[PDB]
Design a protein around this ligand. Structure first.
Ligand code: FRU
Ligand code: FRU
Ligand code: NA
Ligand code: NA
Lengths: 308, 308
């Protein structure tokens, strides 16, 4: 009867998304907060640690995460900096669809004292916005080092948003430094190419071979996901969906993947990994059926019915 | 056939205002931008100078102001800082209803080179957000000094929003320094008390007697406006309105007042001033009939029909 805690950390944000005509839906969001909810909706055991602003948006994000049964014991309210606020342009997708209105937001002031005690077998999942500026960058690296030290596991997803970085020249090396630390890494096909200075996927994975990463997942959008384990790769694909809102789809993917690994006897098992990537594909498809990153994050009942 | 230019300067902002249920209307706003439109709707000759962000909100504000026939020749796009973004809480009114999401926003980086050439007889109108931080504070003071030097006139409205100031201990003296420079000053009854460390209005005006201000207008909400000229005061009141949205009502007041003084043979004439405060009251009432600071700013046809 296995179920380990999965810690999520980084930016919780309010997503302003076009609706009425000149109206905005006010949607809960922020990539690591999206994953935290995703895991919880699947009956996972997720917990968030980090900083939001001491403002209504921050409180809306707090209440949102606890409403969703995500542990917020270690979610702090920064006394001066504002909660992240992003405007979405639906004509674009992924990184190119976001406009960040608060730089630096409260999360970029994550301090060492905000890290909770890690235990053996627990998971930690991280995105690159957490590495964008100080003190969050160095705080986040310290937390990764502490999780590995204790016998836990590290999940990383670049999830790139360049305009957040005050020194964008530092993105490549900083992101690749975290890749070098994780047990599990997930790229989009574009991010992998971009980050390894390569064209094609095969050359991408080449550039990181020396890292001995236990599991690299490269999502192919239409064609599913490529699953790279030591000395083997294969494509795992499921059903497709004409998407209504692609926002946070990649996070739902990460949600399913981490829910399944977190309840596994042994996450390194290949049958286990393949199954996990099958849940991850279903989640990512379903998540696109309603506006808002979190709105359509599936419970197990929905997911199984979609996969069958 | 008189009509002088009225320069407005400071913050242009996008006001997020509750609507649907968890929707936000996206409304043009920002106090000095509200006054600029107000003057133009009355067929005035208004012009805005200052900085917005090089982002969609900034461009939305630019297009808004030129659509409204306000001269934006001297409206600059800051290369790094974001456009001001404010969340409105309709349960409160005035200052207490605003949450500022961008601090410091692009306008707080107003530089000396952004000031346009002033001419004799022109007007300049200023709010305290323009004095909140540097370099805008010192830039704004320099522009006031330059307008007086050339033979033009200065309008000031505290229009207080405390959370914008990085050093809020500096608000009182900085605001009062600008009061000491203006030909025309308008307070709310609350701001006057607050700013002169007094209770009642009579004691308030006492504290500023030494300034020899040509015209002080104190708006009484329900009871109209108190008009203080050298050695005389009187209340000017008009019809009342159950307000739907009080947002920017004070700015519409300032709009009418400055439109009328700007087209006058001699703004110092008492009949002229009294008439101006009558237009100002009508504007402030009408402005509250629709959500959004700028939405219900009246044209002359509307205003006269309301006043008759
Ligand atoms: O992946 C989706 C999430 O990524 C962000 O752009 C930054 O965290 C959020 O605004 C959005 O919800
Ligand atoms: O007076 C109304 C205006 O004042 C502000 O709070 C700050 O400039 C704006 O958000 C609003 O439109
Ligand atoms: Na979605
Ligand atoms: Na209004």
């Amino acid at each position: 009867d296995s179920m380990s805690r999965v810690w999520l950390t980084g930016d919780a944000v309010v997503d302003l998304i076009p609706d009425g005509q000149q109206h905005y839906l006010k949607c809960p969001g922020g990539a690591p907060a999206n994953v935290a909810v995703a895991i919880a909706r699947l009956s996972g055991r997720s917990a968030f640690f980090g900083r939001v602003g001491n403002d209504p948006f921050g409180r809306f994000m707090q209440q949102t995460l606890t409403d969703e049964q995500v542990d917020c014991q270690h979610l702090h309210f920064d006394p001066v900096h504002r909660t992240s606020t992003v405007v979405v342009d639906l004509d674009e997708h992924g990184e190119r669809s976001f406009t960040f209105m608060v730089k630096p937001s409260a999360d970029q002031f994550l301090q060492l004292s905000d890290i909770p005690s890690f235990q053996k077998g627990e998971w930690l999942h991280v995105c690159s916005i957490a590495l964008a500026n100080q003190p969050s960058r160095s705080s986040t690296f310290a937390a990764i080092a502490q999780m590995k030290e204790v016998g836990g596991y590290v999940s990383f997803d670049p999830n790139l948003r360049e305009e957040v970085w005050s020194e964008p020249q530092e993105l490549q090396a900083t992101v690749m430094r975290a890749v070098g630390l994780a047990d599990v890494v997930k790229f989009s096909e574009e991010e992998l190419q971009f980050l390894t200075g390569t064209q094609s996927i095969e050359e991408g994975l080449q550039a990181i071979a020396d890292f001995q990463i236990p599991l690299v997942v490269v999502t192919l959008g239409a064609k599913g996901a490529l699953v790279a384990t030591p000395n083997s790769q294969q494509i795992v694909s499921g059903k497709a969906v004409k998407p209504i809102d692609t926002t946070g789809a990649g996070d739902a993917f990460v949600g399913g993947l981490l829910y399944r690994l977190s309840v596994a006897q042994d996450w390194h098992n290949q049958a286990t990994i393949l199954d996990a990537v099958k849940w991850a594909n279903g989640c990512g498809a379903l998540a696109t059926t309603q506006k808002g990153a979190m709105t359509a994050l599936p419970n197990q009942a929905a997911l199984y019915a979609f996969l069958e």
